[PDB]
Amino acid sequence: NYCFAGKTSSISDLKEVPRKNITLIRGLGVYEGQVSPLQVAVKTLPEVCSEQDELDFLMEALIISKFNHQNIVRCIGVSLQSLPRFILLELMAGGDLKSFLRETRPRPSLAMLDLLHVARDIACGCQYLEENHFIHRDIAARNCLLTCPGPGRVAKIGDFGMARDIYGGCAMLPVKWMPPEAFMEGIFTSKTDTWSFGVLLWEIFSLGYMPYPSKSNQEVLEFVTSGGRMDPPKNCPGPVYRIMTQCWQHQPEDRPNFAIILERIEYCTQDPDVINTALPI
Template sequence: GGYAGGNAWSANSTNGEGGYSFLDPSRTIPSMSEARSGYHAGPGSLLVIPAIPGCGCNYRCLALDARRSQVACICPKDWKLDSDGKTCILLDAPDTFSDWLIVILFLMLVSLMIAFGFVCVLLYNRYQHRTVGLVRRKMISSADLQLNRLPVASNNMLTEYNPNYEFAGVTYTLKDLKDIPRNQLQLQKALGQGAFGEVYQGFYRQRSGDAVEMPVAVKTLPALSTHEAEVDFLMEALIMSKFNHPNIVHFIGVCFDKHPRFIVLELLAGGDLKNFLRESRPKPDKSSSLTMKDLIMIAIDVAKGCNYMEENRFIHRDIAARNCLLTTKGPGRVVKIADFGMSRDIYRSDYYRKGGRAMLPIKWMPPEAFLDGIFTAKTDVWSFGVLLWEILSMGYMPYTGCANRQVMQLVTSGGRLEPPTNCPGPIYGIMTQCWHPDPDQRPNFKLILERLGYCGQDPDVLKAALPVFNRAPSQEKDVTIMRPGSHDHCIEVSKAAADYLIPTSLGPNTIGSTSSVDRLIPDNSDSWETSFVIPHSKSTQPLLPEPEYIDEVTTSSVSCETAAQLTNYEKFFRPPICFLEPHLYQNL
């Protein structure tokens, strides 16, 4: 740049206004780049000396005066002059090779670290898997060894060796259980808590490519289980795998490759029989969907399953409505026997000589079972009689209002459950035959099936009405025990009655008639309290207190125990839970 011409002078003069000077500082020496507007007043001149090559400069030579007595080297844009004053160096020139080398080395180092960590994790997992596998194989081998040795007799007590549990004389091991690949099993939702762990509803594909899924119930054994629970779980799987009958829950297979372990069973969507009966009770404003024919068919289904077990010399030991499941609640229902937990315990040598605590269904057990520890096929016959009573009472609790030790005293003294309301005589006759004190005199299940079949064809039996309930019981457990103020309202049981007293039959007007408990209710009473005098038992065996299932403890015999104070709603109807005094049985 240089001077720029200014405006023409307004006066008649040869000179115009002063111009402006511009110097580009990027191409000049900083000391010479100063420019001011109007710095020079008056005429001026500009000497332009172009930069030229030479002078020993790497790029160009710049004259600092008109005579070029002083020169300086300059460099192009983005270059700078080196310390020698002649060489040009590129400004901020990146070292491309060095940067890429650093990046590559860093990536290689990270990759090596990742690979090393992966190898370490892989080796650790392999070590853990091998260690856990050895432990589990040792555990399974130990459990399998116990299963193989279970049928061996003990010299301490003959009843510890029970041939009914040898599965037709053949010893079975875990290898006989059908293994289900875990990836073909899908759990959907929890159904409830079982004896070992959660029970789930799920779906099972028989082959990995199948589109059809079978609904199943899956019993689980969690990883943190005791060795005893492990053996029990395996034993239950072995027991259930041996049955193949339409009235026994179908065993599908097991997943024992790792924890949690699974037992896969068919899914019975109808729920348990006890709750089904309670839900189906007729109300004053609503009749039941069930008929007497339906109740008989339910009993026949259970009897068929029991007959199959009896023919295969197997004892269930806990035949009850709570342990029977239904395929559906609607028409076409099939009842199946489930829950073989009590049967599983027969393999333990300490069951008959318990040093700890065990849960026993006292209200469903005959005297020889809870007093002497004797379990035979006729034990299940007695239990079936109580189950039949549950069916005809629409799911009522047997011996309601009595504790288990009272029930033991009552049963050993000859007392029995009274017939449920509107119970046909022939069906109650089957019950009393099942409750015969002499096990040899009780019918087998083949005979029970025959008699139930006759009942299902008897018009007088089929037209019997079901009991009507104003409301469902709010409690399923025994209610509060109250001691009476006087023995006037006690049902006297003869103190001369022998253990296992043989009951005698009722008169023709007794079946379905007003019970002995009704006679104890004061007129216009707002509460209902009944009491029972139970004589001293002649047995020296330990008695077992607690509801429905009872912990075994040693205790003395009980004389006069009290009955229950029933809730206020029960004054509106006569519940079918009364007991027959021994002197009422005649000619059975």
């Protein structure tokens, strides 16, 4: 049983697709697939898995199925009555955002306005989640996807594994994306996602760098609790960095909600001094 947006659903509300219509085309590093012809992404549940795993996998399908927003990957259906168990998802030809930023890094193509649109796209999805009282818990560039690598790309939140687990270890917590109260007290609110979006904003304008580059998890933990914060990414415009620093306010009540973040991202797309800033090569 899953609840969201005022309703409770179950494995039944999902759209079961008969296994016979589903064809795998590639591994994607998750597979490209076909449904008779619709092009989809197929998330597979290993047959070698525990019973906790099985329930983990079912919840994710219910979670993503209850969202209706252009910046959240669509759930096409499921194939759970056959093995291995499939979740069918919107295909995002652009791939994940962290790799795209790394491969598309300018070299001897991509401009400041493109990064702001990605940031706006993800901020729009987070607002939708916030307005519906869903806490993602793992906003990060690795969990965002792009429709296409070229112009007119749209970014969307693509993975909800963390929100399903707490619905898995100290060395596995995304500490570098978490605010103090989260890794200290295990408190999670919409203001948890605000902090994480700030780190995501740093990932975006650093063009795919790991946050707190030379630090370890425990170093970051002690750095952040003491009040330390990352420096601007190379060439990052001031107005963009100021969004990050507002997202990283120590007290959650001093952080902006996602409506304000969107508002400030849009004001940055209207500033020539911002969008005419060159990326580092």
